[PDB]
Structures are given as structure tokens and as C-alpha cells.
């Protein structure tokens, strides 16, 4: 993947957004923006240029799964990589993420190494 | 946990 790939980090908890952003920076990905929920995220996505989405599962107004579906059903954004982040891995949620088209699924908190590992699995799958 | 982990592994997550 290109070091300048533009990421959108979505979470209603500001501290977690900062942490994910810092983890991305640690891996050399500096082009990162933030959104506080699914609605805010879609609003900023309408601006264009985004190449990767990392979204939390539980957020008000529009949660992670709802954001993911919206992206996948949109003609311009349908192929965007989306890594889902959750507080707890659950069978039902995992199957739901698969059905909706999640590129990845990871439990927080996670280290830089783990993030790197999840991103690389997605890049490889997508030939990025 | 073992099962959750195997599910994730099977799905490529």
C-alpha cells in the first residue's frame, strides 16, 4: 500500500481515535482523518479521496455495521477497505460483519503490530 | 475463545 493512503478513523471516543491515529503513524501512515460516528463519517467521505476506513462497532446515530453496509451499497465507495473494530469478539457479530462485507475484524485494544498484521492481510487480499 | 478464534481464522479475519 501507498504510505499516503488516506485513512478515515471512526469512533465516538476521541481518545481511541487518537490512539488508532498514532498507531497508524507508527506504521508510516500519516494521511489520517477522523469521524465521530457513521453519519459524520459518511459526510466526510462525500468529500472523496479516502482509501481505507477503520470503524468502531458501537457509535450513536449510525453504528459501525450500518456505516459498513452504507459504504458497500454505494456505487462510488463499494470497494473501500473497511476494518471493523470491536470491544468483544462475538460469533453473531463476526458473522454479521462477514455478511455486510467487512474487510477485517479486530478486537480493541490492539498493538501496532496487530494493526499492521490486519492491514497487510487486507492489502494482500485486495492486491494493494 | 477457541471457537471464536477458529471462526475468525476460517473467515480470514
PDB file of C-alpha atoms in Angstrom:
ATOM      1  CA  UNK A   1       0.000   0.000   0.000  1.00  0.00           C
ATOM      2  CA  UNK A   2       0.993   3.582  -0.568  1.00  0.00           C
ATOM      3  CA  UNK A   3       2.237   5.458   2.544  1.00  0.00           C
ATOM      4  CA  UNK A   4      -0.116   8.307   1.555  1.00  0.00           C
ATOM      5  CA  UNK A   5      -3.267   6.161   1.533  1.00  0.00           C
ATOM      6  CA  UNK A   6      -5.896   8.354   3.193  1.00  0.00           C
ATOM      7  CA  UNK A   7      -7.470   6.691   6.218  1.00  0.00           C
ATOM      8  CA  UNK A   8     -10.665   7.635   7.990  1.00  0.00           C
ATOM      9  CA  UNK A   9     -10.732   6.547  11.623  1.00  0.00           C
ATOM     10  CA  UNK A  10     -14.253   6.382  13.022  1.00  0.00           C
ATOM     11  CA  UNK A  11     -15.112   6.155  16.723  1.00  0.00           C
ATOM     12  CA  UNK A  12     -17.245   8.236  19.096  1.00  0.00           C
ATOM     13  CA  UNK A  13     -14.443   8.055  21.690  1.00  0.00           C
ATOM     14  CA  UNK A  14     -11.870  10.731  20.874  1.00  0.00           C
ATOM     15  CA  UNK A  15      -9.045   9.070  22.817  1.00  0.00           C
ATOM     16  CA  UNK A  16      -9.404   5.834  20.859  1.00  0.00           C
ATOM     17  CA  UNK A  17      -9.353   7.790  17.597  1.00  0.00           C
ATOM     18  CA  UNK A  18      -6.106   9.433  18.690  1.00  0.00           C
ATOM     19  CA  UNK A  19      -4.614   6.103  19.651  1.00  0.00           C
ATOM     20  CA  UNK A  20      -5.510   4.498  16.298  1.00  0.00           C
ATOM     21  CA  UNK A  21      -4.139   7.523  14.506  1.00  0.00           C
ATOM     22  CA  UNK A  22      -0.913   7.235  16.499  1.00  0.00           C
ATOM     23  CA  UNK A  23      -0.676   3.533  15.726  1.00  0.00           C
ATOM     24  CA  UNK A  24      -1.112   4.302  12.005  1.00  0.00           C
ATOM     25  CA  UNK A  25       1.588   6.972  12.278  1.00  0.00           C
ATOM     26  CA  UNK A  26       3.853   4.422  13.880  1.00  0.00           C
ATOM     27  CA  UNK A  27       3.444   2.300  10.764  1.00  0.00           C
ATOM     28  CA  UNK A  28       4.171   5.229   8.488  1.00  0.00           C
ATOM     29  CA  UNK A  29       0.584   6.122   7.535  1.00  0.00           C
ATOM     30  CA  UNK A  30       0.340   9.882   8.177  1.00  0.00           C
ATOM     31  CA  UNK A  31      -2.638  10.785   5.969  1.00  0.00           C
ATOM     32  CA  UNK A  32      -5.397  10.223   8.543  1.00  0.00           C
ATOM     33  CA  UNK A  33      -8.701  11.953   9.272  1.00  0.00           C
ATOM     34  CA  UNK A  34     -11.305  11.334  11.934  1.00  0.00           C
ATOM     35  CA  UNK A  35     -15.098  10.999  12.216  1.00  0.00           C
ATOM     36  CA  UNK A  36     -17.175  10.687  15.393  1.00  0.00           C
ATOM     37  CA  UNK A  37     -19.894   8.365  14.105  1.00  0.00           C
ATOM     38  CA  UNK A  38     -21.304   6.822  10.929  1.00  0.00           C
ATOM     39  CA  UNK A  39     -23.184   9.932   9.843  1.00  0.00           C
ATOM     40  CA  UNK A  40     -20.189  12.179  10.401  1.00  0.00           C
ATOM     41  CA  UNK A  41     -18.084   9.560   8.604  1.00  0.00           C
ATOM     42  CA  UNK A  42     -20.327   9.447   5.528  1.00  0.00           C
ATOM     43  CA  UNK A  43     -20.423  13.216   5.465  1.00  0.00           C
ATOM     44  CA  UNK A  44     -16.616  13.388   5.259  1.00  0.00           C
ATOM     45  CA  UNK A  45     -16.442  10.507   2.794  1.00  0.00           C
ATOM     46  CA  UNK A  46     -18.586  12.538   0.383  1.00  0.00           C
ATOM     47  CA  UNK A  47     -15.528  14.758   0.094  1.00  0.00           C
ATOM     48  CA  UNK A  48     -13.636  11.966  -1.721  1.00  0.00           C
ATOM     49  CA  UNK A  49     -10.028  10.774  -1.734  1.00  0.00           C
ATOM     50  CA  UNK A  50     -10.384   8.222   1.088  1.00  0.00           C
ATOM     51  CA  UNK A  51      -8.702   4.870   0.618  1.00  0.00           C
ATOM     52  CA  UNK A  52      -9.245   2.988   3.887  1.00  0.00           C
ATOM     53  CA  UNK A  53     -11.793   3.029   6.720  1.00  0.00           C
ATOM     54  CA  UNK A  54     -11.264   1.853  10.313  1.00  0.00           C
ATOM     55  CA  UNK A  55     -14.545   1.933  12.219  1.00  0.00           C
ATOM     56  CA  UNK A  56     -15.697   1.081  15.682  1.00  0.00           C
ATOM     57  CA  UNK A  57     -18.706  -1.204  16.099  1.00  0.00           C
ATOM     58  CA  UNK A  58     -20.795   0.823  18.578  1.00  0.00           C
ATOM     59  CA  UNK A  59     -21.486   4.507  17.866  1.00  0.00           C
ATOM     60  CA  UNK A  60     -24.593   6.705  18.134  1.00  0.00           C
ATOM     61  CA  UNK A  61     -26.709   7.926  15.198  1.00  0.00           C
ATOM     62  CA  UNK A  62     -25.154   5.320  12.920  1.00  0.00           C
ATOM     63  CA  UNK A  63     -23.038   2.464  14.203  1.00  0.00           C
ATOM     64  CA  UNK A  64     -20.217   0.557  12.549  1.00  0.00           C
ATOM     65  CA  UNK A  65     -22.261  -2.143  10.873  1.00  0.00           C
ATOM     66  CA  UNK A  66     -24.672   0.457   9.487  1.00  0.00           C
ATOM     67  CA  UNK A  67     -21.729   2.504   8.200  1.00  0.00           C
ATOM     68  CA  UNK A  68     -20.212  -0.597   6.608  1.00  0.00           C
ATOM     69  CA  UNK A  69     -23.420  -1.511   4.769  1.00  0.00           C
ATOM     70  CA  UNK A  70     -23.875   2.064   3.504  1.00  0.00           C
ATOM     71  CA  UNK A  71     -20.362   2.015   2.083  1.00  0.00           C
ATOM     72  CA  UNK A  72     -20.819  -1.364   0.432  1.00  0.00           C
ATOM     73  CA  UNK A  73     -24.138  -0.382  -1.167  1.00  0.00           C
ATOM     74  CA  UNK A  74     -22.713   2.857  -2.637  1.00  0.00           C
ATOM     75  CA  UNK A  75     -21.559   2.833  -6.273  1.00  0.00           C
ATOM     76  CA  UNK A  76     -18.528   5.046  -5.640  1.00  0.00           C
ATOM     77  CA  UNK A  77     -17.404   3.627  -2.264  1.00  0.00           C
ATOM     78  CA  UNK A  78     -18.409  -0.028  -2.597  1.00  0.00           C
ATOM     79  CA  UNK A  79     -14.856  -1.393  -2.758  1.00  0.00           C
ATOM     80  CA  UNK A  80     -13.272   0.690   0.053  1.00  0.00           C
ATOM     81  CA  UNK A  81     -11.398  -1.449   2.565  1.00  0.00           C
ATOM     82  CA  UNK A  82     -13.166  -1.400   5.924  1.00  0.00           C
ATOM     83  CA  UNK A  83     -11.609  -2.722   9.114  1.00  0.00           C
ATOM     84  CA  UNK A  84     -14.136  -3.183  11.891  1.00  0.00           C
ATOM     85  CA  UNK A  85     -13.032  -2.669  15.489  1.00  0.00           C
ATOM     86  CA  UNK A  86     -14.948  -4.136  18.427  1.00  0.00           C
ATOM     87  CA  UNK A  87     -14.707  -4.325  22.217  1.00  0.00           C
ATOM     88  CA  UNK A  88     -15.586  -8.007  22.155  1.00  0.00           C
ATOM     89  CA  UNK A  89     -15.418 -10.727  19.535  1.00  0.00           C
ATOM     90  CA  UNK A  90     -18.793 -12.482  19.325  1.00  0.00           C
ATOM     91  CA  UNK A  91     -19.893 -15.172  16.860  1.00  0.00           C
ATOM     92  CA  UNK A  92     -23.031 -13.336  15.842  1.00  0.00           C
ATOM     93  CA  UNK A  93     -21.168 -10.050  15.315  1.00  0.00           C
ATOM     94  CA  UNK A  94     -18.426 -11.782  13.353  1.00  0.00           C
ATOM     95  CA  UNK A  95     -20.973 -13.439  11.055  1.00  0.00           C
ATOM     96  CA  UNK A  96     -22.789 -10.124  10.727  1.00  0.00           C
ATOM     97  CA  UNK A  97     -19.531  -8.386   9.745  1.00  0.00           C
ATOM     98  CA  UNK A  98     -18.871 -11.056   7.138  1.00  0.00           C
ATOM     99  CA  UNK A  99     -22.363 -10.752   5.662  1.00  0.00           C
ATOM    100  CA  UNK A 100     -22.050  -6.983   5.400  1.00  0.00           C
ATOM    101  CA  UNK A 101     -18.635  -7.102   3.714  1.00  0.00           C
ATOM    102  CA  UNK A 102     -16.133  -6.171   6.431  1.00  0.00           C
ATOM    103  CA  UNK A 103     -12.566  -6.373   5.049  1.00  0.00           C
ATOM    104  CA  UNK A 104     -11.312  -7.131   8.534  1.00  0.00           C
ATOM    105  CA  UNK A 105     -12.461  -7.557  12.122  1.00  0.00           C
ATOM    106  CA  UNK A 106     -10.248  -6.856  15.142  1.00  0.00           C
ATOM    107  CA  UNK A 107     -10.746  -6.602  18.907  1.00  0.00           C
ATOM    108  CA  UNK A 108      -9.574  -3.500  20.750  1.00  0.00           C
ATOM    109  CA  UNK A 109      -7.286  -2.759  22.337  1.00  0.00           C
ATOM    110  CA  UNK A 110      -4.612  -3.904  19.875  1.00  0.00           C
ATOM    111  CA  UNK A 111      -0.932  -3.165  19.319  1.00  0.00           C
ATOM    112  CA  UNK A 112       0.716  -1.566  16.317  1.00  0.00           C
ATOM    113  CA  UNK A 113       1.984  -4.983  15.286  1.00  0.00           C
ATOM    114  CA  UNK A 114      -1.549  -6.391  15.309  1.00  0.00           C
ATOM    115  CA  UNK A 115      -2.885  -3.442  13.324  1.00  0.00           C
ATOM    116  CA  UNK A 116      -0.085  -3.835  10.804  1.00  0.00           C
ATOM    117  CA  UNK A 117      -0.925  -7.516  10.520  1.00  0.00           C
ATOM    118  CA  UNK A 118      -4.626  -6.844   9.901  1.00  0.00           C
ATOM    119  CA  UNK A 119      -3.922  -4.109   7.343  1.00  0.00           C
ATOM    120  CA  UNK A 120      -1.451  -6.307   5.459  1.00  0.00           C
ATOM    121  CA  UNK A 121      -3.931  -9.165   5.284  1.00  0.00           C
ATOM    122  CA  UNK A 122      -6.403  -6.784   3.644  1.00  0.00           C
ATOM    123  CA  UNK A 123      -3.849  -5.195   1.294  1.00  0.00           C
ATOM    124  CA  UNK A 124      -2.744  -8.621   0.110  1.00  0.00           C
ATOM    125  CA  UNK A 125      -6.309  -9.818  -0.415  1.00  0.00           C
ATOM    126  CA  UNK A 126      -7.088  -6.683  -2.455  1.00  0.00           C
ATOM    127  CA  UNK A 127      -3.767  -6.608  -4.313  1.00  0.00           C
ATOM    128  CA  UNK A 128      -2.981  -3.222  -2.830  1.00  0.00           C
TER     129      UNK A 128
ATOM    130  CA  UNK B   1     -12.422 -18.415  22.765  1.00  0.00           C
ATOM    131  CA  UNK B   2     -11.025 -21.395  20.853  1.00  0.00           C
ATOM    132  CA  UNK B   3     -14.152 -21.390  18.716  1.00  0.00           C
ATOM    133  CA  UNK B   4     -14.210 -17.606  18.232  1.00  0.00           C
ATOM    134  CA  UNK B   5     -10.576 -17.818  17.190  1.00  0.00           C
ATOM    135  CA  UNK B   6     -11.218 -20.642  14.727  1.00  0.00           C
ATOM    136  CA  UNK B   7     -14.156 -18.772  13.202  1.00  0.00           C
ATOM    137  CA  UNK B   8     -12.031 -15.672  12.697  1.00  0.00           C
ATOM    138  CA  UNK B   9      -9.278 -17.827  11.197  1.00  0.00           C
ATOM    139  CA  UNK B  10     -11.657 -19.629   8.811  1.00  0.00           C
ATOM    140  CA  UNK B  11     -13.135 -16.343   7.581  1.00  0.00           C
ATOM    141  CA  UNK B  12      -9.714 -14.778   7.013  1.00  0.00           C
ATOM    142  CA  UNK B  13     -10.065 -12.154   9.764  1.00  0.00           C
TER     143      UNK B  13
END
